[PDB]
């Protein structure tokens, strides 16, 4: 890295800086005073104070990008969100007043609740004990649990789709199916959890 270890990650929260001084906890108040005598990293090209920037969706975009084609990957995510909004508007208009209440037309809220439905609480680590490969039930961190949900989505759509279907049409159809706990990405989570019960007694081999 070209940043020395003494550099601090930038804080790009607009409201945080403009809060009244008394509203800030003394711990936060102390850090701000310390940061005045430190070096701050430059903000990333994609780090902005925009009110429409969601870290979860921005991360999902980077996991789809191939060869640094951010314009294409962002376009694919923009087309997906729109394909989900247009799919719920059609259902909402073609539904009764009672049914209309339940229907969710926010694509950003369908994406977050979809991913969370696919996240697995426990995973598996492959281990070779006595020249035999065993996978031991592991408890997954918040970072490993989130990564696996996004990875499983980007892999079901990339591979298990018809040749002429497009990613905005497969991903939209999968975010909505996961949003209802019916999709194949949810089935992957159910299989992972079910296998952990099979290897329930083999967690002892853990050394880490």
């Amino acid at each position: 890295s070209r940043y020395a270890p003494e550099f601090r990650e930038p804080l790009i929260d607009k409201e945080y800086y403009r809060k009244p001084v008394a509203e800030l906890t003394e711990e936060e108040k102390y850090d701000q005073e310390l940061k005045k005598t430190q070096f701050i990293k430059a903000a990333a090209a994609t780090e902005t104070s925009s009110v429409f920037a969601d870290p979860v969706i921005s991360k999902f975009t980077n996991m789809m990008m191939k060869g640094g084609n951010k314009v294409l990957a962002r376009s694919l995510m923009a087309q997906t969100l729109e394909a989900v909004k247009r799919k719920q508007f059609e259902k909402y208009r073609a539904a009764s007043a009672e049914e209309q209440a339940t229907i969710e037309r926010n694509p950003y809220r369908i994406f977050h609740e979809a991913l969370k439905n696919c996240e697995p609480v426990i995973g598996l680590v492959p281990i070779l004990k006595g020249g035999h490969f065993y996978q031991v039930p592991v408890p997954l961190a918040d970072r490993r649990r989130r990564f696996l949900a996004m990875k499983w989505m980007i892999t079901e759509c990339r591979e298990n789709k018809p040749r002429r279907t497009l990613m905005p049409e497969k991903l939209s159809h999968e975010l909505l199916e996961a949003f209802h706990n019916r999709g194949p990405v949810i089935k992957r989570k159910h299989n992972m959890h079910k296998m952990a019960e099979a290897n329930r007694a083999l967690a002892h081999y853990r050394w880490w």
Partner: protein, 49 residues
């Protein structure tokens, strides 16, 4: 800037300085960026502004 920067991410980078200080629609900027690609030119302007 809409013509020069057809990509949304480059325009968002120009918005960050003003949006952060809630000063959108209060200043008129004239830029002269030479060198680099689309993303490097938006970032250079962001710091200059």
């Amino acid at each position: 800037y809409l013509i020069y920067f057809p990509i949304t991410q480059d325009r968002e980078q120009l918005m960050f300085p003003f949006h952060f200080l809630d000063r959108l629609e209060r200043h008129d900027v004239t830029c002269t960026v030479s060198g680099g690609g689309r993303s490097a030119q938006a970032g250079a302007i962001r710091l200059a502004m």
